Write a protein that binds this ligand. Structure first.
Ligand SMILES: COC(=O)N1C[C@@H]2C[C@@H]3O[C@]2(Cc2[nH]cnc23)C1
Length: 130
């Protein structure tokens, strides 16, 4: 219905606003673009599904997310990719892991304060009807 297409348009406006607020935070610059395959050639042999905040906006505009749950699966993949590629005790690996955990925790905290639980349940019920 038109009403259902209006629901998904509100979901996309909400997701673009959360993603912009993450992308302007200086702590998260290392997640604003794909890991460069010329600078890091072993990256795409270790990490089987690369993800970053530029790719997330492209996916919102392609209508890939029909719930906040499917958006948070991609924020969780950015975080898990950084923990698995950079696992060592040295400071550069510890700094990127701390930033990855802060990106995940920040996204979940904005959604807990600003997403209405009944708006998410409406998106889930339209998705399950298709
Ligand atoms: C999310 O970003 C990462 O997982 N990274 C892996 C790399 C390791 C380290 O930071 C890079 C880029 C780079 N070039 C030279 N060393 C590095 C970004």
């Amino acid at each position: 219905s038109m009403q259902e297409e209006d629901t998904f348009r509100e979901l996309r406006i909400f997701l673009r606003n959360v993603t912009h607020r993450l992308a302007i935070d200086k702590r998260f610059r290392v997640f604003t673009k794909p890991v460069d395959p010329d600078e890091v050639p072993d990256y795409r042999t270790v990490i089987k599904e690369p993800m970053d905040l530029s790719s997330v906006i492209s996916k919102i505009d392609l209508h890939k997310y029909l719930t906040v749950k499917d958006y948070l699966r991609d924020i969780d993949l950015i975080c898990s990719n950084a923990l698995e590629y950079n696992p060592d005790r040295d400071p550069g690996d510890r700094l990127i892991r701390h930033r990855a955990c802060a990106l995940r925790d920040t996204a979940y905290a904005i959604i807990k304060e600003e997403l209405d639980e009944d708006f998410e349940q409406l998106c889930e019920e339209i998705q399950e009807s298709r």
